[PDB]
Amino acid sequence: RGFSSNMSHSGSLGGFGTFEFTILMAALLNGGGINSNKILLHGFSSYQLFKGVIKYLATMDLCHDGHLQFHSNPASKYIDEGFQTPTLFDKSTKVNILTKMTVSSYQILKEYAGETLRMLNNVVQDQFSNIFLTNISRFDNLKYDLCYDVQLPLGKYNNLETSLAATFGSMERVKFITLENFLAHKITNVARYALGDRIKYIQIEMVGQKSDFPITKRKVYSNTGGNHFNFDFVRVKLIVNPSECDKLVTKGPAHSETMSTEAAVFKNFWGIKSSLRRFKDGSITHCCVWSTSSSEPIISSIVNFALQKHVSKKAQISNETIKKFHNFLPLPNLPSSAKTSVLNLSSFFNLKKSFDDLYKIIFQMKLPLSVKSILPVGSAFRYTSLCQPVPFAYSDPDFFQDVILEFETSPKWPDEITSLEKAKTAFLLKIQEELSANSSTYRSFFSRDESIPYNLEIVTLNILTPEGYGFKFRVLTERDEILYLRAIANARNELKPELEATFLKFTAKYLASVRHTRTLENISHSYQFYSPVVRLFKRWLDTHLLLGHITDELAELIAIKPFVDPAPYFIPGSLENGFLKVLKFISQWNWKDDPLILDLVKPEERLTLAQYKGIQMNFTNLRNSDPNGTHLQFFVASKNDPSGILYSSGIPLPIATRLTALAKVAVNLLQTHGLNQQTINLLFTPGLKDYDFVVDLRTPIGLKSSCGILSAPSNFPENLNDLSEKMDPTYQLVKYLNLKYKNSLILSSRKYIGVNGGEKGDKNVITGLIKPLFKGAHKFRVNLDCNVKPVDDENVILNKEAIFHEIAAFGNDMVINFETD
Amino acid sequence: LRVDEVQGKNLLTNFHGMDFTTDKLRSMVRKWQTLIEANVTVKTSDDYVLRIFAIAFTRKQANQVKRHSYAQSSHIRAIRKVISEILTKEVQGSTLAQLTSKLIPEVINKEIENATKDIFPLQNIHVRKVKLLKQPKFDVGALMALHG
Amino acid sequence: IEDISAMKNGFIVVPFKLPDHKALPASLHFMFAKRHQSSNSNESDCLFLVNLPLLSNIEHMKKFVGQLCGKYDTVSHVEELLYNDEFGLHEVDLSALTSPRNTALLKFVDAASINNCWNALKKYSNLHAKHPNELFEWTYTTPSFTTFVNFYKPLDIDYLKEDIHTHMAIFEQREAQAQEDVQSSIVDEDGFTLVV
């Protein structure tokens, strides 16, 4: 955890190391309780003693509300009085042991002590690798949420009265011995009163300081950082509170007749940002009114103003990396889109009120059956749509939201799938009759759904709203599962896994979507940063042409691991932290030998030992028949999906190894080259390499603004046949390209054209890999499924050129440039 | 209803219970028929523990001759059991507002109706009560998701 | 390479010149043929065709066989294109369950068309060796912007209602005159597979 007995008052993370551990545990062997009783016995094992120390520092405070008494020359005695410092007090030597600790060092020690107490109290999952075998202190970008790079050219000693806004005089040299002590203390106090409860923890790291110096010198000498003291510059590390960071009001003292102390300190601290405001409950309060940004949070502005007021005018605070992370978020085509906070979901609420206005009209309609349930399972209902829901921006493929329609338990459902789905469609015709009869502001048409293969009659009901949203209705009955299982029982041995695939996509479509939307939208108020994480991660899949093959909900469940499994880190409190946790984990998880088992609950219903071991034995039974992961690569299983194959099947292997490979490229990139603008530009840079062919596409009409992405949508057209005029044809292009060349090719494309298709949102690229099965000559078969050419009268090899003419003529006007290997 | 939050000539409330008037059920209870009840303790998705009741009454069919049309004292076991397994299915899903959105048009009663009709047909069946005792926590986060 | 006229199992090698394109800097697509052998009534005088071109419709097949009749001066008329499941959509039959890939069967009008056109494919199979520029060029129909956005176009509602009423109005009456006891017979035949 990067902790040691080094002086943490010199701007470092330490003060508590091996020596204070030995003094503390040797003290706990001689008491430690409130009534001086024994916490740890000499006859305990090392796990029981270690659990006693971590349990003690997790439970018992020793900085503000307590301190510990002990005797070196009789038992240890906890006292419930703290002296606003980490205090470990001896009686025989009268030594405050934790003098080298700061207050935030002990609060961080108590938080990691509680995290490690929860890791030891975890009775299901492994935490040994978390506690003892994972260096969390390698990257401050992963160990902390917000690091601010602070430059302070203080100069020499005589320049300090012109470079320090505070006084470094007599009493400062008495108490705070060196300049890094009083400097780190000053930035800690001004930053703590500046942010306060917007964050969780905070450290001040003096970068580049030294304690080793040659024997020819009296002290440590330096000239770096525009000054001649022992550091280079000041970094501000931050662990952020998700609920209180991006608030528009920094509340101060209340307003009464006579000014108190804290109000004079409040206007003395903020000044022009200190003002009075009437709040909604009738109170009058000094506060600070701020503005959110779509490119940054408020915290950069608060630490910016506070360091540029109460430390030095010469301060240079920069964090442009997190500004680039907010600038790669899709900018919605909305009024006041620039001042929109990172944690605001108001367009989702507009789709929610639109859906409620739909539901109160349709749910009280009179039909031949009373309505059982109407279930929203769209992605926007679980806050996972890559573009935010923009009114009338139907060019984005996240526009139509999937809604299940379930009617009441009735024997009106035939025992054949065509008459069943056509009966559903005729019910949607009667609902369309009532809807067009009396809901003339709503619009509606019908569409096909071939995403369930061979079920050629699923017709979705498409309703366009005056709130600018579009939905689709699809009917689920009780007669479905019996008929599909009957088709499972009916098939011969040759046709079984394809009906496992149609049935598996059926369960992924109608069935698990309800509890999926329930669970994700239910716990969505527990991890508020998760939605820009999954939307940015889907954009990372879209830039590297990986969003098409790997499904969205699988990226949701892969992406949900840093929040539901916080160990050994904390809860991610920034897009940068959790996003590089997802990429970091995909870089260091091996899907062949390691399973991914999730726990989809709220923070402190969970799995027991028997269900967890049931999942792991399903992993063993998986890897018995699939040892190298040829058929099945990703295993993501939990309570709602114990199979692990429901949202992770049908995947070619170079897609998975290309995902893990580009993950290792990203993580090793941030290991080697550090973090700046250019490496983040490389993270969304499509390499377009190691392919058999690359096709360059451009539709002749740009569609970025029609996707609701600011670089405006107005209404739906009169003839809805014109909706196809603004709908992506390249998805049907690459769609049937995947459909014809399933056995012979692996094809990847950018599914979202308005996001990554250039400045106009009109560019695309098809990257194509030939499988290693079809690289050489093979015996000619009547069931070969490959475009070939004869090398003799019996063998054939793949003719690439004829496929190339078929792709170019299949993309007659949009294939502009064709590149090969 | 039950108060949770207050903001300055506004305060927000939450669903605590649902009850029938005394005039409504005492309208129903006629002579020469059988009164069938059921109770179930069942948890929601978010851990609201709530115990609902149930009321069930026997009707006469068309072209009955006899004046009572009672049950068999084993069909009542066959009636209480079908209601008991149905009520545990519909609870623990999509927190109580959608369950409140099912209680208002009483969709629950048709599900009771169709399944248990194969045993013995029925009449008026309603829900008659729901009350809660195990609210987990304060939890402002999910509260403001219903607001406009 | 050029001197190949037929495979081991008798498939006539049929070459195809491929047209040029903007993004491309003369290639030959290869479709193979055989006389189909089945006593089926709808499969008589058909050609078992392996590795067909992209978007193979009855129009461009009548175009190709029309070029065959124009070249060798014979008479051969094409009736119907059979089993052309290019994307795998009509592979798995599910409706009989719930109650040869990249091949086709080219149906002609009679036996003289498959005989004389079979001999015309016998002579056309040697033009890979003899005259490579005198081969028949295959011209693909090209799906435009409008053709790919046909898949997003709205369904025609009234013909759907016609297909509902005319679909149920025949099959529910055949079912209605083959009613209840036969239904018990078949479902409890899934009975004798349900115990045994």
UniProtKB/Swiss-Prot annotation, chain A:
GO terms for cellular component: 90S preribosome; CURI complex; nucleolus; nucleoplasm; nucleus; small-subunit processome; UTP-C complex
Q: Origin, by domain of life?
A: Eukaryota
Task: Provide this UniProt record's keywords sorted from A to Z.
Answer: Nucleus, Phosphoprotein, Ribonucleoprotein, Ribosome biogenesis, RNA-binding, rRNA processing
Q: Which organism is it from?
A: Saccharomyces cerevisiae (strain ATCC 204508 / S288c)
- Member of which family? Belongs to the NRAP family.
**What GO molecular functions are on record for this protein?**
RNA binding
Q: Which GO terms describe its biological process?
A: maturation of SSU-rRNA; nucleolar large rRNA transcription by RNA polymerase I; regulation of ribosomal protein gene transcription by RNA polymerase II; ribosomal small subunit assembly; rRNA processing; tRNA export from nucleus
Described by its record, this protein's role is as follows:
Involved in nucleolar processing of pre-18S ribosomal RNA and ribosome assembly.
Record protein name field: U3 small nucleolar RNA-associated protein 22
Coiled-coil region list: none
Primary location: nucleus
Q: What else is known?
A: Present with 3260 molecules/cell in log phase SD medium.
Subunit details for this protein?
Interacts with snoRNA U3. Interacts with MPP10. Component of the ribosomal small subunit (SSU) processome composed of at least 40 protein subunits and snoRNA U3. Interacts with UBP10.
Q: Which residues of the full protein are shown?
A: 373 to 1237 of 1237
Keyword Iron-sulfur in the entry? The reply is no
The record's subcellular locations are: Nucleus, Nucleolus
Swiss-Prot record, chain B:
What happens to this protein after translation, modification-wise? N-terminally acetylated by acetyltransferase NatA.
UniProt-recorded Gene Ontology molecular function terms: structural constituent of ribosome
Question: Where the protein is mainly located, per its record?
Answer: cytoplasm
Output one GO BP term: cytoplasmic translation
Task: Give GO cellular component annotations, separated by semicolons.
Answer: 90S preribosome; cytosol; cytosolic small ribosomal subunit
Instruction: Answer yes or no on keyword Phosphoprotein.
Output: yes
What keywords were assigned to this record?
A: Acetylation, Cytoplasm, Isopeptide bond, Phosphoprotein, Ribonucleoprotein, Ribosomal protein, Ubl conjugation
Localisation:
Cytoplasm
Q: Which family does it belong to?
A: Belongs to the eukaryotic ribosomal protein eS1 family.
Assembly description: Component of the small ribosomal subunit (SSU). Mature yeast ribosomes consist of a small (40S) and a large (60S) subunit. The 40S small subunit contains 1 molecule of ribosomal RNA (18S rRNA) and 33 different proteins (encoded by 57 genes). The large 60S subunit contains 3 rRNA molecules (25S, 5.8S and 5S rRNA) and 46 different proteins (encoded by 81 genes). eS1 interacts directly with uS11 and eS26, which form part of the mRNA exit tunnel.
Q: What's the miscellaneous note?
A: Present with 92400 molecules/cell in log phase SD medium. There are 2 genes for eS1 in yeast.
So what does this one do?
Component of the ribosome, a large ribonucleoprotein complex responsible for the synthesis of proteins in the cell. The small ribosomal subunit (SSU) binds messenger RNAs (mRNAs) and translates the encoded message by selecting cognate aminoacyl-transfer RNA (tRNA) molecules. The large subunit (LSU) contains the ribosomal catalytic site termed the peptidyl transferase center (PTC), which catalyzes the formation of peptide bonds, thereby polymerizing the amino acids delivered by tRNAs into a polypeptide chain.
Q: What is this protein called?
A: Small ribosomal subunit protein eS1A
Q: Which organism is it from?
A: Saccharomyces cerevisiae (strain ATCC 204508 / S288c) (Baker's yeast)
Give the taxonomic lineage as stored in the record: Eukaryota, Fungi, Dikarya, Ascomycota, Saccharomycotina
Swiss-Prot record, chain C:
Q: What else is known?
A: Present with 2610 molecules/cell in log phase SD medium.
Would you identify the family this protein belongs to, as annotated? Belongs to the RRP7 family.
Chief place where the protein resides: nucleus
> What protein does this entry describe?
Ribosomal RNA-processing protein 7
Alphabetically, the GO molecular function entries are: rRNA binding
Q: Which UniProt keywords apply?
A: Nucleus, Ribosome biogenesis, rRNA processing
Q: Please indicate if the UniProt record lists Electron transport as a keyword.
A: no
Q: Where in the cell is it found?
A: Nucleus, Nucleolus
Source taxonomy: Eukaryota, Fungi, Dikarya, Ascomycota, Saccharomycotina
Name the Gene Ontology biological process terms. maturation of SSU-rRNA; nucleolar large rRNA transcription by RNA polymerase I; regulation of ribosomal protein gene transcription by RNA polymerase II; ribosomal small subunit assembly; rRNA processing
rRNA processing as UniProt keyword: yes
- GO cellular component assignments: CURI complex; nucleolus; nucleoplasm; nucleus; small-subunit processome; UTP-C complex
Subunit arrangement?
A: Component of the 90S pre-ribosomal particle.
* Role summary: Plays an important role in the synthesis of 18S rRNA but is not required for the 5.8S and 25S pathway. Is necessary for the cleavage at site A2. Is required for efficient association of RPS27 with the pre-ribosomal particle.
